[PDB]
Every structure is written in structure tokens, then in C-alpha cells.
């Protein structure tokens, strides 16, 4: 769970993440962390990258998502790991 205050943090995705977000219809350069997480979840569902049987497993070795996270797969249960991977791919506004 991202804290309520952290959800409204304004961020500028780096180019690969921005490309991912725009492929599912995002249309700006600046987002809240909450918005980034909405579009990422949507992306994973649109590309059907989750295991249908154990739906916390995401496979991304042959996908853009694997290129920007730098991993071949991950578990949605790894909250810290995911936040770390996402933060590597954006600049926090004014930081």
C-alpha cells in the first residue's frame, strides 16, 4: 500500500515508462503516483501478462515492461520491490 500522501506525489515518467503509459491511452507527461499505478495495472491486464491460475505472477521477459523493470518476472505481492522498480523509472517533481 502506497501512503495517502505518497499517492498524490507528482512525477514525470522517464521515456520507456512514458511509452508504456501512452500505449494504454495516457496522454500527459506529468502524473500522480496513483495515476501511474492505475495505468500500469491496466497495461498488465491489457497485455494478459498475469498467470491465469496464480494471478499474482507477472511474466515480462518478452515485453516492454521487462525492459523497464529489468526483470523477467515478478510477484505483485513484492510491494517494496515493485515501488523500487517504478521509482527508478520516473523523476519526482522538484526532487
Amino acid at each position: 500500500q502506497i501512503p495517502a500522501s505518497e499517492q498524490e506525489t507528482l512525477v514525470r515518467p522517464k521515456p520507456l515508462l512514458l511509452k508504456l503509459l501512452k500505449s494504454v491511452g495516457a496522454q500527459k507527461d506529468t502524473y500522480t503516483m496513483k495515476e501511474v499505478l492505475f495505468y500500469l495495472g491496466q497495461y498488465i491486464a491489457t497485455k494478459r501478462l498475469y498467470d491465469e491460475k496464480q494471478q499474482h505472477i507477472v511474466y515480462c521477459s518478452n515485453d516492454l515492461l521487462g525492459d523497464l523493470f529489468g526483470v523477467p518476472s515478478f510477484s505483485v505481492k513484492e510491494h517494496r520491490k515493485i515501488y523500487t522498480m517504478i521509482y527508478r523509472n520516473l523523476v519526482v517533481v522538484n526532487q
Binding site: 500500500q1 502506497i2 499517492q7 496513483k34 499505478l37 492505475f38 495495472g41 498488465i44 491486464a45 498475469y50 494471478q55 499474482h56 505483485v76 505481492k77 510491494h79 515493485i82
Partner: peptide, 11 residues
């Protein structure tokens, strides 16, 4: 569980 629910818990 659904991917939707796991991701919503992450969010």
C-alpha cells in the same frame, strides 16, 4: 484472487 485485487492491494 484476481490480478485486479492483488494490484489494488499494491496500490
Amino acid at each position: 484472487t484476481s490480478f485486479x485485487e492483488y494490484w489494488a492491494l499494491l496500490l
